[PDB]
Write a protein that binds this ligand. Sequence first.
Ligand code: PLP
Ligand code: PLP
Ligand code: CL
Ligand code: CL
Lengths: 427, 427
Amino acid sequence: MFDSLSPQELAALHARHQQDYAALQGMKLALDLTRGKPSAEQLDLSNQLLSLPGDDYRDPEGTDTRNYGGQHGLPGLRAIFAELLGIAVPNLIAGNNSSLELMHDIVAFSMLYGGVDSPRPWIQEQDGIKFLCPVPGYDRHFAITETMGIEMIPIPMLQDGPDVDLIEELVAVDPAIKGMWTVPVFGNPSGVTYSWETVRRLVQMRTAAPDFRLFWDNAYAVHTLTLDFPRQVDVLGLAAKAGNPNRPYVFASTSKITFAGGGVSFFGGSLGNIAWYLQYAGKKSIGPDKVNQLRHLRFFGDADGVRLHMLRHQQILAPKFALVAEVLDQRLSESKIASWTEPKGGYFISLDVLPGTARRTVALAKDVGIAVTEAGASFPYRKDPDDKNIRIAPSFPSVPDLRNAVDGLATCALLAATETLLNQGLA
Amino acid sequence: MFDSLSPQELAALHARHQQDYAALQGMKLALDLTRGKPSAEQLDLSNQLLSLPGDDYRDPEGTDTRNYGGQHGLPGLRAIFAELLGIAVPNLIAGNNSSLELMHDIVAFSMLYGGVDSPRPWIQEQDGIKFLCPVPGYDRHFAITETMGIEMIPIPMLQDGPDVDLIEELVAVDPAIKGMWTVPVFGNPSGVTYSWETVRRLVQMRTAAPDFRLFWDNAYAVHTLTLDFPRQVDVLGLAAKAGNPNRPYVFASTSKITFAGGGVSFFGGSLGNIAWYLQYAGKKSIGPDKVNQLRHLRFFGDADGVRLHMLRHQQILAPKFALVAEVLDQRLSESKIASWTEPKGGYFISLDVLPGTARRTVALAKDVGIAVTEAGASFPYRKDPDDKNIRIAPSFPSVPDLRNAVDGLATCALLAATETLLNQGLA
Ligand SMILES: Cc1ncc(COP(=O)(O)O)c(C=O)c1O
Ligand SMILES: Cc1ncc(COP(=O)(O)O)c(C=O)c1O
Ligand SMILES: [Cl-]
Ligand SMILES: [Cl-]
């Protein structure tokens, strides 16, 4: 940490940081690093969708997609994602424009009705319900459990998955633990992909709750930043082999493949779980939007069509991620106050600044017109116990804007560090 | 009832009915009068949607509809339905492809969280919850309350609304009554449209539950079978004037305007109710499909565009409804065993055959290859206490198929009547 600088040298460095920050403030910036959404250039890749499906409104089975019926979604589109996810067509359904809505409804159904093999609806559990939450994690997962009054237990992330030793120890003895949130490939925002061994342990471990569920939110399933695709671990297959076929609920989406908010969602599970979901989903809706599923089927053609499309996204995104890392390295590496992820896929870089300074860094950035994700955002209840983590979303801005924004962020992180050491430390 | 026929004459008539039925059976029919969905010819009216929105993916406000954001739906599309429904844009949101899903989620939110001004979540009411259900009514409404364990109280339908005297008497003294299902224009399947006076009474009546709600499912809001449109009663305005602004929840849909399952839904309410819904809907989804809302906005143009489109539907549908009535009249009127609605809009005709024979009539039809809606389908718990009601859906089949199907249905209804009088009555 500022290795071998004396207090006098640190005070001189702090003055340089203040001057960098004054200059930054003079530029009157209006930049934003918070939006985990595709750029306009990425969305342009899918503009053919805007004139699809055209005159032929029938799918390959002859179904008139313009009329009512069919809860499972179009088999032809499901076959594409069955190949990508390694889940058979009967074990996969296609929904409307939101995978979050599938996860949410599953939690709501679990509360009101219980899961397919629950002893009772979760709302009838007088001692409450808990979910395990690997951190840093996805704030919209946490929002679902928080709103339903489900207690969240944060779990440390390690190199090839969460802390599975700890998870096993907790779930074995606490029947209130009903679920775990995961993003098992390129996690938001850790960038961590769960190893085969991690997945095997999670589907085999003994749980005090007979109806424990892994919410396997494979949001980034094909979302590589390199020219290679990750191998999908067969979580449903491994779970069935362990005698826990109902344990995993698998989700996926085309929001960051085609149009964000105009895509198609997917839910995968055991046949029993598919039937359970559809029994209650059938009370909610006659069924999903088949015309939008058809447009996607026509656009993609097959699984290789999706893969090639992802490589086109990769060509736009990879330079943005490379840029963020390069700027952070060049500005922060020598000070040793920070560390950051170097993800091989997904939509985020996770930055840790000097512990005790993340909130301050965000406030400094806000005052020079750079929006940076709120401190604590990737934690349940927004509680980052070390006040160090900042999520960075590189996807949306132009390269020149991203460069300025991250360089500004670095200036703020450095100033927050020297300010705190000198003014609080050497008070 | 078979006026002035002697027992010998009735037995001879019964023999003629058996011969008509034998002949019907010989035709080896495969017909269906159960599907409340638009015909292919109606759906063809909206085929321009299949190539929309085209290159311009921006709405009039400049919003890129292909990207995330915006929970309320596109203001331009909401402005069209604001005019049609008589509800201001800020009081109306546009969703995805299902109005049922809006109603369902509202009931689920009410259970888990309570409504905006509830004393507690409805799930915490130890003595249970009840909804009033005007009958005959919409089976998918009843499916929502049944699945949530909400007791249903059936209420007789009268000429210009339900039995409001009875509703007022019950809601005043039972704090467990939290809601009422309605279809207030061209009801499914009564065809009844609630008068202004009926609506005024429903929004003014005292309720023991301070958070009582009218589920105002205006599914058939513009769905005329004549060249005239019904006047929309201002239920939200009247409710606000009575000091019960939060009482009505208004729903509408384009499923029977454009594509059934590929349309846009709407929810309208007080500003407080809109904010309440969106607070919990925001935990479920980042927001609705704006691209599909844009296609609809481009297609319709304005409220008069929707109206003209409905008159194009009316030209297809009205002859089908006229045909059903003519066949029933010609075959059944003299026997006086039956009565049926003559709706001025909506998607159904409600037929009452001889009480005690509806199940038998349906079974007879099934055995000659004519699918007719299950007896009891328009009642909570599928309980028609008079075993008389049969819902007829005229919209889907071709004219020649409809003619054959309804004429067959009449033959079955007549045979069920004579069979029952002779074999059970004169046993
Ligand atoms: C982990 C994760 N799941 C789900 C989603 C949202 O996808 P959808 O648009 O299908 O809700 C996101 C980002 O949108 C995400 O990061
Ligand atoms: C009364 C009523 N409400 C709602 C609906 C369904 O509309 P949506 O497709 O918007 O769920 C129907 C028929 O579909 C209906 O008859
Ligand atoms: Cl997560
Ligand atoms: Cl109803």
